[PDB]
Fold this sequence. Notes:
The complex is a heterotrimer of chains A (212), B (129) and C (214).
Chain A: E1 4-7, E2 10-13, E3 19-29, E4 33-37, E5 44-48, E6 52-53, E7 61-74, E8 84-89, E9 95-96, E10 100-104, E11 112-116, H1 120-125, E12 127-137, E13 143-148, E14 157-161, E15 171-180, H2 181-185, E16 189-196, E17 199-208
Parallel strand pairs in A: 2-10
Antiparallel strand pairs in A: 1-3, 3-7, 4-5, 4-8, 5-6, 8-9, 8-10, 11-12, 12-15, 13-16, 14-15, 16-17
Chain B: H1 5-14, H2 25-36, E1 43-45, E2 51-53, E3 58-59, H3 89-99, H4 109-115
Antiparallel strand pairs in B: 1-2, 2-3
Helix pairs in contact in B: 1-2, 2-4
Chain C: E1 3-5, E2 9-11, E3 16-23, E4 33-39, E5 43-51, E6 56-59, E7 67-72, E8 77-83, E9 91-96, E10 109-113, E11 122-126, E12 137-147, E13 153-156, E14 166-172, E15 177-186, E16 196-201, E17 206-211
Parallel strand pairs in C: 2-10
Antiparallel strand pairs in C: 1-3, 3-8, 4-5, 4-9, 5-6, 7-8, 9-10, 11-12, 12-15, 13-16, 14-15, 16-17
Amino acid sequence: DIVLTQSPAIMSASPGEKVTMTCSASSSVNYMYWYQQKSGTSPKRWIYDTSKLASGVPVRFSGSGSGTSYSLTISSMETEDAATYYCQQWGRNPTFGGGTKLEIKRADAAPTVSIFPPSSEQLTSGGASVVCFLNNFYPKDINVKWKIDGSERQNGVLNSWTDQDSKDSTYSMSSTLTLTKDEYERHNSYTCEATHKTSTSPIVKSFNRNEC
Amino acid sequence: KVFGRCELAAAMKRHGLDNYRGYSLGNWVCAAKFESNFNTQATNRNTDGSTDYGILQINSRWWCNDGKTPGSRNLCNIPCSALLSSDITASVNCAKKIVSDGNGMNAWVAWRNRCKGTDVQAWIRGCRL
Amino acid sequence: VQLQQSGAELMKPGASVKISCKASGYTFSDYWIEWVKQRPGHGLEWIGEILPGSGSTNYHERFKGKATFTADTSSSTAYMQLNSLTSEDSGVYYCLHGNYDFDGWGQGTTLTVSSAKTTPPSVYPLAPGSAAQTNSMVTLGCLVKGYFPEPVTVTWNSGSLSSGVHTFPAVLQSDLYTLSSSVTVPSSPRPSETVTCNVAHPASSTKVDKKIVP
C-alpha cells in the first residue's frame, strides 16, 4: 500500500563508525521490518516489530521510528554489516523500500588497468572483442573512455563491475568493446582510458597493431 | 467452505445465536454474508499486521492468536486457525465473547455498514429452520 | 526440514510455471508461508501467502490473478503458480516464514522467461603477449561469450587458483550473455607454469578448459 523511501542509496563507513539509515513511509505505518541481504544469499529478517532483533542480529543494531520515519542504527560498524538493508511495512498488502547498500570505506586505491587484443579464435569467428580490466580500486567511481586510432568513441561497450571484494574492500571493472573483424582490421590503435579520484592523468593502456 | 444462507442459518440457530444477547438470527447471517460471504476459509489482512479469520472475520490483534500479530491480546483464547474449520463452533464461541464486551455487534465492520438498521430478518426469508 | 525450493526455470512467454517450497520441520498446517519476488535492479515485491492447513490464501493487489498458491498437506509442500509468464516475470522467487517462532526464508528459484535457445558459450583466452610491465604481475583472463541461459561457472586451474581471481557478472546483449574472469599471478608462473580456465555451462553440457598460451 504505502510507498517507502530509503535515504540514502549507498553508504560508506569504517569499522568503529556509527551508521543510521532511514526509511520513510508516504502514509503512517504501525510497525517496521528491516531485512538484510548479502549478495549471494536470500534476505534474512533483521529487525521486526519496529525494534525487536531477530534471532542472531548482534545487539549493536537498533530500530526505531513511529508513524512515518524509522531507522536502523549500528553503533560499532563492523565489516560484516556490509549488505543491503531493506525496510518493509507489513500491513494490508506489504511493500519494501529500495534498500540502502552499506559498503565499507578503505582509502583510495589506484586501479591496475590492462588491455587485451582479440584472440585468434574470436577473429576466426569474425568477431573481435577488446577487453580491458581495471582491477582493484577504491572508490567505485571509474570512467572508461575508449579511443580508436586516436580520438574516437564506440558503442559496443559492455561494462561490468564486481561487488566490493570481501578480503579488502576494493572494486574491479571490465570493459569490452566488441567489434566486427573488418571494423577491427580497418584500424590500428585501441586505447582504454580511465578517470578515477586517484589521478589527474587518465590511466591509459593501448595497443596499436591490428595490422603489422 | 462456502456455507449457503439457510444451511448457515440452521447451524447458527442451533448454536444459540438466535437472540444471543438480543440480536436475531438475521443479523448473524447478515454479518456472515458481508464479512466473508459465507466462506469459512476467508482471510483478510489489515493495516496493522493482523489478519481477520473465518466466516465471522474475527481479528488476531484482539481476539485470537496467529503467532505473528504484534499486541495479541487473544481474548477468545483460541488459535486463529481453529476459526477456519467447516463447522462453525470455534467461530461462534468466540463471537459470543465479542458481543459480551458491551459494544454489541458494532465490533463487526460489515454488520455495521451493511446490516445495522436494515431489515435483517430478510436473511432468513423462506429458510427452513 | 528447511524451506527447500525448486531449481531454476527457463520458460517461454505465455506459459505457466509452478514452484515448490518444501517446508518440512514443524506442524506445516499451522504457519503462513509468504512468497516474495526479487527483480535484480528493482529489489523486492511481496506476492502473497498461504496458510497450508486451511488453504486460506492472501494476495497483494498486483498479483491477484497472476499468482495462485496451493499446498499439498501430505508432502509438506506449498506451490506457487505463476501464469501467463512474460519477460517481467523473470526474477528470484522466495518462500519464507514471518512469525515469532521462526522467520526462515528459502534460497529462491530463478525464473527466466525467454524464447532464446540454449546456446553453449564460446571461450576465448586472454593472454597479453607483450607484457608492458604493469608491475611484476601478469594478468590473464577468459572471455566467455554468447551463452544462454545463465549460469556459467568459470574456475581457474580447477579451483587451485582461488586468490587473485575476479569473475565479473554477466551482462545481457542481444539475448545472450558475456562474462569475463581475470587471474593475476607473478610474472614467473606464465608461461613457465600453466594457467587454465575451466568454464562449465550447466544448461548445456559444456565443459571447456582454456589453457592460456602466449
